Amino acid sequence: SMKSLENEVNGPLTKFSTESQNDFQSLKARNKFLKNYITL
Amino acid sequence: ENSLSTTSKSKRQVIVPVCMPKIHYSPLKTGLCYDVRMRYHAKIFTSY
Amino acid sequence: RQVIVPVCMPKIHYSPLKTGLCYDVRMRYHAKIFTSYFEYIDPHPEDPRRIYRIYKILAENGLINDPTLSGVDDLGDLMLKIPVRAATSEEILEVHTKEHLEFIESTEKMSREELLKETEKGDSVYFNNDSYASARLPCGGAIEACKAVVEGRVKNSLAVVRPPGHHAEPQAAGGFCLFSNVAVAAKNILKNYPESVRRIMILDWDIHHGNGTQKSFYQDDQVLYVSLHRFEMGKYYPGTIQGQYDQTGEGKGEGFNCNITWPVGGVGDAEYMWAFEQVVMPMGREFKPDLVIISSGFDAADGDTIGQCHVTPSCYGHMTHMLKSLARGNLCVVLEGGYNLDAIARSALSVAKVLIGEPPDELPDPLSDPKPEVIEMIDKVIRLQSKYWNCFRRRHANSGCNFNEPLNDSIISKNFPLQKAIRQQQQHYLSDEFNFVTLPLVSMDLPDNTVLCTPNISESNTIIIVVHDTSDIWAKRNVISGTIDLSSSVIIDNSLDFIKWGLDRKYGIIDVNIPLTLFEPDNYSGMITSQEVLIYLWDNYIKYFPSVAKIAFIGIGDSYSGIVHLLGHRDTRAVTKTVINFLGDKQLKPLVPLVDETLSEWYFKNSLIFSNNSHQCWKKPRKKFGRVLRCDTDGLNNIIEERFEEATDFILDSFE
Ligand SMILES: [Zn+2]
């Protein structure tokens, strides 16, 4: 539950900047990442 | 010492900027998995 | 709360350290003097515009903290700057003659015209007034680099350093080399540390043979030299006998020298992968070195118009990864070759990525199946290496020396026939389920089952002819030692698929076999025999058949000359329509037209020939051979089972 609310507020946040790269948490171990899409 | 010995007192103009290095192995660590809850499962001493 | 293990430091040695780096802006002044305008459209066989490109592209990927591209100290967190010093004269004198040093001490203070005479005079070198100290700076700087390696201040060292130093001899200079680079540094570490370093292995992947350092340790044991280069005995540089594959050291340096020679230009990555995983890893582990050194030259990379090979930088990554695996971790890399800047930039990028510690990326293609000259080359290497080394023995089953003076031919009168056997078994199982007629042939001295004929051939309209020699034999070498097992061998029938495809569509099917004559390089008399029997069978039987139309011919291997001579010395184009042949690897068959001259064009029209990918041509044929086609595989079996559908579709296209 706390991880879900943390990743909610770290994403697109609401109107202000009060509280609001390695390590690539955002699925970026690039090996057939873009290549597994058909790219044609 | 050298006869090459470059001689120009002027600030060299900047060529490249400093960015994040484009590597993806080993500034990172090695993952370990362990828990003592696997030590629950033991054997029943039955024969002798 | 009770402690059981205390806290302390990680008791490691590799990777809290960095990668040592040797670079200076002082090695970019020694330059050529202008002679002719050809140097404007020439690849400039050593330019000083190399090392700054490597330094720039190393700064470009965050591996170097320098925004202004100058020799600084704040290199960053992953690499450590090694200070550079010019060598003293004594260290160069440890391998070079004094008179060579006096010659360069003359060349430092010459005039202009004396310099021009010296540039023309020497062997593929040049000079300048700013040549002495710029030759004094590399090797001593290299002497710094390994000094950071053996003393363990860094993990590994890369010394991007020019001019190269792997062609100069202790006597004289050559090939744009002034001093040695790696031999002098190796001598300096051996002399300076006969306690921590006892064996040094040196590798060369410059596409030119590293003759100079080969000569500098040709009779020593503490240096194991291995180079890779193209040979091409007279033509390609330098083309001397010292680069030959049988030069195996001398004296007590026997069994410490290894050449690898490419027969033809145009190798790729998997040649290098095959050569390393076959050869250099067991020999490197058997040598048990204390330090490996690389004389790198990226001239063999892809996109280079000197060596013309296809080494992607991923191949360089796999190279240096296995070479890092070879020693315990101590390593230094210097640079010798290079002509195209983008290739050496990408190569330097990949080798720096691995030398920091990153895993090498994948190959751009793993399915290449390298060229067979490299295979036969590595067999001829492993023979002599199995003489000297030991780990190659009994794995490739060379079994000691085993240099075989037999294969004597004196009892050749007593021999197994072996061809009547194969043809007899073939006739057996063909007649057993197909009941083919063994049609006779008078007035020639041939075996009986030479031609086999479909029953009720007189009523058959569409008759196809298959011509073949005795089909191929695949055997098995026993892997423990030496010889060939004959009992575990296999006959590979080749025509039978065509025969069955003809039989299930109710076509006339006629087969002829032509044995090969013994101890002949070409089966010339067999070609004569095939011409004889083909002209015979066309005259005696085919001219007299009432119901006959749309004849086709199936050529296999050799003995296509029979069909070529049948097309030439007669005329039969009114009734036959389309020939096909899978040659394989023999010499081609020119057609002589005698009855006509539009017969040549008609032969070019409805005909297809299929050859090897590694045939003697393609290095464009004349139309008197009639539409040959270069397939992409080797062996007759593979091209038959590859293009069988295309050929059988062409045959079905020939008819209605
Ligand atoms: Zn070279």
From Swiss-Prot, chain A:
Function text: Required for activity of HDA1 histone deacetylase complex. The HDA1 histone deacetylase complex is responsible for the deacetylation of lysine residues on the N-terminal part of the core histones (H2A, H2B, H3 and H4). Histone deacetylation gives a tag for epigenetic repression and plays an important role in transcriptional regulation, cell cycle progression and developmental events.
Protein name: HDA1 complex subunit 2
Residue numbers of the full-length protein present here: 591 to 638 of 674
Family the UniProt entry places it in: Belongs to the HDA2/3 family. HDA2 subfamily.
Localisation: Nucleus
Disulfide bonds: none
Subunit structure: Heterodimer with HDA3. Component of the HDA1 histone deacetylase complex composed of at least one HDA1 homodimer and one HDA2/HDA3 heterodimer. Interacts with HDA1 and HDA3.
Misc remark: Present with 1500 molecules/cell in log phase SD medium.
Curated annotation (Swiss-Prot), chain C:
Region Histone deacetylase, annotated ranges: 28-357
Chief subcellular location: nucleus
GO molecular function term, any single one: chromatin binding
Signal peptide span: none
GO-annotated cellular components: HDA1 complex; histone deacetylase complex
EC number: 3.5.1.98
GO biological process: epigenetic regulation of gene expression; negative regulation of transcription by RNA polymerase II; negative regulation of transcription by transcription factor localization; positive regulation of transcription by RNA polymerase II
InterPro entries: Arb2-like_domain, HDAC_PDAC, His_deacetylse, His_deacetylse_dom, His_deacetylse_dom_sf, Hist_deAcase_II_yeast, Ureohydrolase_dom_sf
EC category: hydrolase
Catalyzed reactions per annotation: N(6)-acetyl-L-lysyl-[histone] + H2O = L-lysyl-[histone] + acetate
Pfam families registered for this protein in UniProt: Arb2-like, Hist_deacetyl
Record's subcellular location: Nucleus
Keywords assigned by UniProt, alphabetized: Chromatin regulator, Hydrolase, Nucleus, Repressor, Transcription, Transcription regulation
Other observations noted: Present with 3050 molecules/cell in log phase SD medium.
Family: Belongs to the histone deacetylase family. HD type 2 subfamily.
Name assigned to this protein: Histone deacetylase HDA1
UniProt organism field: Saccharomyces cerevisiae (strain ATCC 204508 / S288c)
Gene (UniProt): HDA1
